[PDB]
Amino acid sequence: EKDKIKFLLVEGVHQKALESLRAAGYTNIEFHKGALDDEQLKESIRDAHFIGLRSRTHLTEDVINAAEKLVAIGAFAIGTNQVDLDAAAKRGIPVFNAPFSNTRSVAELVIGELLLLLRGVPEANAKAHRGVGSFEARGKKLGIIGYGHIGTQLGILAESLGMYVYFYDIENKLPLGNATQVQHLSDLLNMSDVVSLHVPENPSTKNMMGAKEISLMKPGSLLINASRGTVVDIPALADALASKHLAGAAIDVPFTSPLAEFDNVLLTPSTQEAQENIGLEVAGKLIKYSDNGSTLSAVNFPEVSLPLHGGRRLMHIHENRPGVLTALNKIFAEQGVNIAAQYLQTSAQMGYVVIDIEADEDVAEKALQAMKAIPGTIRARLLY
Amino acid sequence: EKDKIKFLLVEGVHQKALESLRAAGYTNIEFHKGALDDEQLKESIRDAHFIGLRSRTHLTEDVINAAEKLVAIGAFAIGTNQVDLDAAAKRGIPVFNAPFSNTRSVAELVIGELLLLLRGVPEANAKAHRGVGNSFEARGKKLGIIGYGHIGTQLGILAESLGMYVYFYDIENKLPLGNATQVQHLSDLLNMSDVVSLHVPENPSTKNMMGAKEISLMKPGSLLINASRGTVVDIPALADALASKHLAGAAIDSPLAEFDNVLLTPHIGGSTQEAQENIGLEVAGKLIKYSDNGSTLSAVNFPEVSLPLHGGRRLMHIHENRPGVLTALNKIFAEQGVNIAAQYLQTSAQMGYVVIDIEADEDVAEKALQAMKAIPGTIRARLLY
Amino acid sequence: EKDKIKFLLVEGVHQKALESLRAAGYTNIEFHKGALDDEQLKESIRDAHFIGLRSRTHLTEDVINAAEKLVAIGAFAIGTNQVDLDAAAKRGIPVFNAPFSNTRSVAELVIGELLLLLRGVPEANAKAHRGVGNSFEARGKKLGIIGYGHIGTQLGILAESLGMYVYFYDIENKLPLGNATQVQHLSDLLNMSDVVSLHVPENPSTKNMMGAKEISLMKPGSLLINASRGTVVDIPALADALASKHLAGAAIDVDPFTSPLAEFDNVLLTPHIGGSTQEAQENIGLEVAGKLIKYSDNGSTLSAVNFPEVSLPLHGGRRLMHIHENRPGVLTALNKIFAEQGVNIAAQYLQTSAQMGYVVIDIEADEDVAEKALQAMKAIPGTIRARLLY
Amino acid sequence: DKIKFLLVEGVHQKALESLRAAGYTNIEFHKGALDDEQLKESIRDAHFIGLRSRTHLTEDVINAAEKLVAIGAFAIGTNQVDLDAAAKRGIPVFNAPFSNTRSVAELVIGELLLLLRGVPEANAKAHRGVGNGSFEARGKKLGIIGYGHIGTQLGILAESLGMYVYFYDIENKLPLGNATQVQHLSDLLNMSDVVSLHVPENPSTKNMMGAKEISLMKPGSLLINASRGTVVDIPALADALASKHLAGAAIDVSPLAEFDNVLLTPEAQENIGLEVAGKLIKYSDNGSTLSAVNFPEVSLPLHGGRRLMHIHENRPGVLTALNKIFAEQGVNIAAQYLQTSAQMGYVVIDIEADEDVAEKALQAMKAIPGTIRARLLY
Ligand SMILES: NC(=O)c1ccc[n+]([C@@H]2O[C@H](COP(=O)([O-])OP(=O)(O)OC[C@H]3O[C@@H](n4cnc5c(N)ncnc54)[C@H](O)[C@@H]3O)[C@@H](O)[C@H]2O)c1
Ligand SMILES: NC(=O)c1ccc[n+]([C@@H]2O[C@H](COP(=O)([O-])OP(=O)(O)OC[C@H]3O[C@@H](n4cnc5c(N)ncnc54)[C@H](O)[C@@H]3O)[C@@H](O)[C@H]2O)c1
Ligand SMILES: NC(=O)c1ccc[n+]([C@@H]2O[C@H](COP(=O)([O-])OP(=O)(O)OC[C@H]3O[C@@H](n4cnc5c(N)ncnc54)[C@H](O)[C@@H]3O)[C@@H](O)[C@H]2O)c1
């Protein structure tokens, strides 16, 4: 929304990212197919309002402090280990990544794994390669644990394969297609011919699939954990495979070493069709942060976003010290200006707040100046 | 989550709602299979903190103002015309409906409508019934979806199953389902589509968004579908495009009664029988979360607020929208010596609602609560946890 | 696949048809965007071995007999009202149409009908256009398919994708696709179905198979769809069932036959059904061009509309074909001919009709003997035409 | 109906259901396989025998039979049956050709999904301790060669996964869904990200996928052969794998054992039961030998009238004799379908006549030299 806002994109992010940026009115783009050298990065990033990078660019504390106009960082990938998160945060610079771009990919893999495991293909294949010398998926029940981005897309594909889909989730969800939410996990485990996990990594899920749960699964069933974490007690999984209670499994990958001996287990390890989704996803985050201040899904920043309801919108980033918010609201109160919406979120170190006001530019601009002055302020900006 | 919080459910909402309420720790439930007479409703709702009803129960201003403990209203259906929204709002009472349980039926409806419209069936059928004597496959056709949310995504899935190519336009990037493709400019989506279906909310950004200009950008001989909305399409313009034959047909909802190639579906806000379970789950969920964390997401007569749960203490304040409320709040926490961890204030009409998370002990939180209730213009405030 | 084989195509058949012919080695093609006048037609179809036409071409006996090289006619459409079937048959000229090109289109139509009928849209729509003022999801419902053939099968696939449970009744055992289930007894399929769709041909076994008794057997509040045909459903019984509300609605392909239904707002009457646009045109083009190619190369008359149907698998050797009047002695004459040449018949397929017979014969012999047999076969009394396919 | 049905190795209850459905009662069932002594005893008066992969139906056992009309192999196909001995006796052997269609289509989907992602190789390495392809299926093109039972069901599943389906066949096929026929094999091969073969085993398919065909395939593509034949030239495929021209493959079972990016593979008994039992019944009723594995295939449309069938040694003069019989009797032949195999000849003849005229032609047909058997079907 201004050709003065410079976007520096390196390591060759997908073209759709550029298409998205231009459609939103941001055409001041410096593009690079490969990584920049230290000296090249420093001079290109110096006046960049935004930088988009992948895995090879190292955004160290020094490079960041060197950038004098940096507003936000877009990690066009899932990982952000190449970016110094804390350094960016201290300067009020959010880092966005692409957390859901691999959704479809994981769903397809699960389908491929269950189809072959159900037929005992992995074991037959390993023996064939050594010189040594089974059911249809349709009509079978798939039990999905975690019915979110991946869980829902998987259920859709499973139904297309003629499977009956059931899911367990700690939250009530709207079923897509003929899927059925099962309230008790043990009930899901009992019915399921195939069980697939798609939950996040947290105390709630730590070893949720232990000896007991695996014991609850149907005799001859399959356990899939296509996306890597710590949700499955590997030793317990190994015992159930050795005992043959489970006819096979697929686990994302030592730690899985106990499974290496099993021919009926599939062990599987940002360079494919993911680039388009990533380009669209991350450019979108940069665009929205620029236009409306949304930090939803930022990885090193308090998360906030507010619907577009007209009026003027300002944003304030500050060290989380008592008195800042009081100073902020005072600016509008002592002036009789009304606040239509306000959303503040904090961390131990920082506080981020977006405010919608009913006023004209003059007042808005004036308010912005006062805001920047408030002690503890890191950055302040008038969004519209 | 207390067992003293009374839930009054009338007109026989699905048993799943009760199970859900019980699972959330709410067991103080009065349940009736049907509607009650004016006398019974008044007696039953007098001490009800929450009421769940359907289309028959008339929750009028009188009834509302008489219910002295009412905290929230849940319409276990889509419509809320039987509920006096403004009356409830004035009392700081949000009204929740079931905005998503009927997602699937709207998607199925659009598929049925486009399939027949494409073949010219509505027109051929109307003439056939009048005695007057008298097409395209959907397969390989492009479906343009405006608003890729709950309905758009499900519609896209069904359309791809019919062999159609799905493209969509939205005001933000959306993760696509199947082979659906996002299109950055609305004009481009309109240009390429053989069928355009609208699935967006009602609000200044969508009022008449499909006007004479947008409709003329649609492909010649295309179809426009507005399955369940309100004021998104400029009717005069649509009639004009139909008369000129720019569009081969449409489905909506008049000046359109003259067109045999237009399907008119008088009121669709009706929830299906198969959806009663989902509705019970959906609306009970809304009441529960409002009661527990103050979320007013999806409320139909209230500013929408929702703050992630990060422990600590949480307070909520409903008031007359005006400058100085927030400042009045800051001073109270300052005097009380507490820092605000998170805050979310939204306004709608002449009303303001704000949820505040603070780190403080029970006593301090209560003292803050009493002060907050004394702020002039305050409608009500409570300590959620 | 020689070059002396001419293809006359009028009324602009789809390019796919030509691509198909060429790929098959038939390049001698005379294309025309539209129909030709009586003078031009006779002039063009003069030395044409094959002709492909549509609806705007009248192939009369005069035109046909005028043609001295015509071996087969391609009607790139469903109907063949425009061609003199008997005249072609008398000349030993088979007529091929596009029997299954509209399969997908009908299956799509059924889905659209049941979706709207299930929600009561036809009725609400009719009332709305009149000023008068004013429902179940398809997902989870059971679809009962009577006749699991071309359409039945594609319909079932679309229904399952819509989340419906598919069951079908057919007089012959079928390999179900997806989760489809074959039901042995009609009464059973009829009792369990929320929607029943008919996709059977018009023969004695189907004549009014859906009578008052069958309809009464249907689940109360169900839908009946017959999106093609005309003799499988008893309209009077249907109207009664709709009047009593035993059925919630219906879709019937339409007319004195459907008049009893005109008063029902919850019934969809749909005329034109057979020949969409470029899309249906592409299927048709590929289908009929294929028929012509197969007839030319191996003598197959499967699906011909005015000819005995014969089709013999390709097993090498020499292939001859003989078209004749159904008079006695022809079959005997054929044998005698091969005995004298001391040739063995590997396979023979003869089929007949009114007063005409068609036989394809596979023999073991050198071209030399083949051609000698061909000439002999042509001299058989009652012979209309004979050819050496390969 | 003195039509005894001997069933061994325990065929699914459905076969029994089916036979009964057609009145055909009299069923000697044996959950297990009988032996030489008992087998000859039970098969002695057996009209139809149903067996699996273990029964050894030798020339002796068959010769032992005296009323055997057909043999139903309720399995992947013929097994320990002396097909040749069976044919000599004018006895067709029916198997279950399309019963596991769905199963093969599902297998191909599973294989291409993993191969596209390089999982086979990654998995092989992971099981050897080593650590370290990869693409989604949606948006990719699947090239099917042989658009028949399996090909069509495969296309349906492929499209549901978001793939674009193209197929090549030797005749025009009605496409299901968005499947598109491609006229030239070379075009199909080059455009495909995945090629799967579903063609019959015969001369026109033997090694049809050679060095030339494989070189025409897109670089980094996958070749899948679930067929039960030798359609692919392994030596050529191996070369294409070593050179990385192909990113992987899946084949039924070696030179490919060295390739980690190659998949090597080996209750539905209900289908088999209903399919095979269905062949046995149709043959008894209308004489159809469609799909028989050791018999000329003949199938004639039921158009009323009388239907006579004749099985004979392929001696010249049989057809001459047959047609002379009807000629002399002044009986018109409505339809006639004769097909032959290396040793046998089978013809079905439809005529317009009453019982009298029929049985008259039947006795004369039985008297022809080379006759193995002849029956009045109806
Ligand atoms: N989607 C992607 O692109 C991607 C990429 C890499 C890794 N992952 C990983 O895959 C997993 C799932 O990802 P997603 O995108 O579908 O996540 P998601 O957030 O959309 O859904 C996770 C689901 O799990 C449910 N859940 C949480 N705790 C649960 C519990 N204890 N029991 C049952 N259900 C519970 C949640 O309510 C939610 O519906 C996560 O571990 C994620 O980190 C996803
Ligand atoms: N889901 C149901 O059961 C149901 C029942 C009756 C009526 N409706 C109506 O259908 C509409 C959409 O419902 P939904 O469930 O899909 O809602 P939703 O919130 O899930 O999705 C609406 C989508 O519209 C997009 N959008 C918003 N403003 C837009 C604009 N100006 N231009 C383009 N896209 C825009 C949003 O980003 C979002 O993705 C609403 O008007 C709703 O009242 C829904
Ligand atoms: N497929 C098309 O393109 C097309 C175009 C125009 C009209 N039609 C009409 O649609 C109908 C069906 O067409 P189709 O292409 O699927 O035909 P089809 O021949 O493929 O299948 C008809 C099915 O009906 C079954 N059947 C026959 N008699 C039966 C009986 N008495 N009871 C139960 N099942 C019986 C048959 O076994 C077969 O499976 C026919 O009336 C046909 O004329 C089809």
Ligand SMILES: NC(=O)c1ccc[n+]([C@@H]2O[C@H](COP(=O)([O-])OP(=O)(O)OC[C@H]3O[C@@H](n4cnc5c(N)ncnc54)[C@H](O)[C@@H]3O)[C@@H](O)[C@H]2O)c1
């Ligand atoms: N369907 C099953 O259950 C099953 C089980 C085991 C093995 N098989 C094997 O799979 C293969 C195909 O099985 P199906 O059931 O789909 O057979 P099918 O007969 O239904 O289809 C084979 C298809 O191949 C086409 N074709 C023939 N020769 C061709 C050629 N040279 N090039 C291209 N296409 C050609 C045919 O026209 C036909 O459409 C066969 O080898 C069969 O023995 C099938």
